[PDB]
Amino acid sequence: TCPFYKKIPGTGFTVDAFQYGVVEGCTAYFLTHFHSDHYAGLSKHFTFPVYCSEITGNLLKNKLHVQEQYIHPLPLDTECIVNGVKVVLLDANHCPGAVMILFYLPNGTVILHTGDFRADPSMERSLLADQKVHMLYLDTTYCSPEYTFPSQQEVIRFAINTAFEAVTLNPHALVVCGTYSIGKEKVFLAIADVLGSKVGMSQEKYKTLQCLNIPEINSLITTDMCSSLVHLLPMMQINFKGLQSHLKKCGGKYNQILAFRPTGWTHSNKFTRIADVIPQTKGNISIYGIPYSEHSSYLEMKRFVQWLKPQKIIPTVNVGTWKSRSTMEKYFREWKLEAGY
Ligand code: NI
């Protein structure tokens, strides 16, 4: 049954609740972003109103074949009325088209649902600055102090520098980047830009990227693998057997692979700096795991929450175990005592 942390009290609304059938009392289903754990259940047979960003709506129409008449895209940073209730969508700094949702309840309560987000000080100058928020539905994916990772900019500099050095040493090296969902497009786009190449990929992945409103995209990506020296493959194929196999397919054009796996966190993070990251190598194949995250680190999360000063926090991630829940509630209390709210 639909969990309470997916329902918005005082409304007919749910958030990211498409796998429970017809939710009793729901007049409008919101979708924060196009990741499978959140859209699970949507298809061309869905006949209730879905509210989302323009980009999410492009993906629902083209990838899932949801019919147009049920897709209700909203502009960002704009006050809109849905079924009698004021709402605003804000950029969540997650994957393309990902939003946070502000609900202004008829009784005066203000609720922020973060969806999935990577908290940033730029959010402290959005429409959140303009009123008090009482209840926070929080993406707690990395809510423990061990979770440190570098800025996205530090990680992309590492990747660009590594790829440019390798391919300038060996012009017959191929760069491969793993993917299994939208998000993290900067990794492969920044590497292709430094090398003067388009990114090559499957027809299914090309179609997905063509839904994302990325500027100048026709100039950056392609389905002609033979003309490209950056290839995208499924994440599952980023291992020595998979990569050896792909190298065979390229008809002797290449004699080395340098591959990237953009993991979120890996416990190499508690000891090692980005400057110090090294690959796993076998023969003429090297694999780098790079800590590119689209979720808040512990410290980014804590700064956002201590700024916002909500009256009540409802976690949306790691809620299935008592140990996790109790850990998270302890940190919430520390933060509140340290800041004084
Ligand atoms: Ni997500």
UniProtKB/Swiss-Prot annotation:
Tissue: Expressed in brain, heart, kidney, liver, pancreas, placenta and skeletal muscle.
Record field: transmembrane: none
Highest rank taxon of the organism: Eukaryota
Compartments it resides in: Nucleus
Upregulating conditions: During mitosis. The mRNA encoding this protein contains an internal ribosome entry site (IRES) in its 5'-UTR. This 5'-UTR generally suppresses translation while specifically promoting expression during mitosis, when cap-dependent translation may be impaired.
Annotated family: Belongs to the DNA repair metallo-beta-lactamase (DRMBL) family.
Quaternary organization: Binds constitutively to TP53BP1. Binds CDC27, which is itself a component of the anaphase promoting complex (APC). Binds PIAS1.
Function recorded in the entry: May be required for DNA interstrand cross-link repair. Also required for checkpoint mediated cell cycle arrest in early prophase in response to mitotic spindle poisons. Possesses beta-lactamase activity, catalyzing the hydrolysis of penicillin G and nitrocefin. Exhibits no activity towards other beta-lactam antibiotic classes including cephalosporins (cefotaxime) and carbapenems (imipenem).
Name recorded for this polypeptide: DNA cross-link repair 1A protein
Species whose genome carries this gene: Homo sapiens
Residues included from the entire protein: 700 to 1040 of 1040
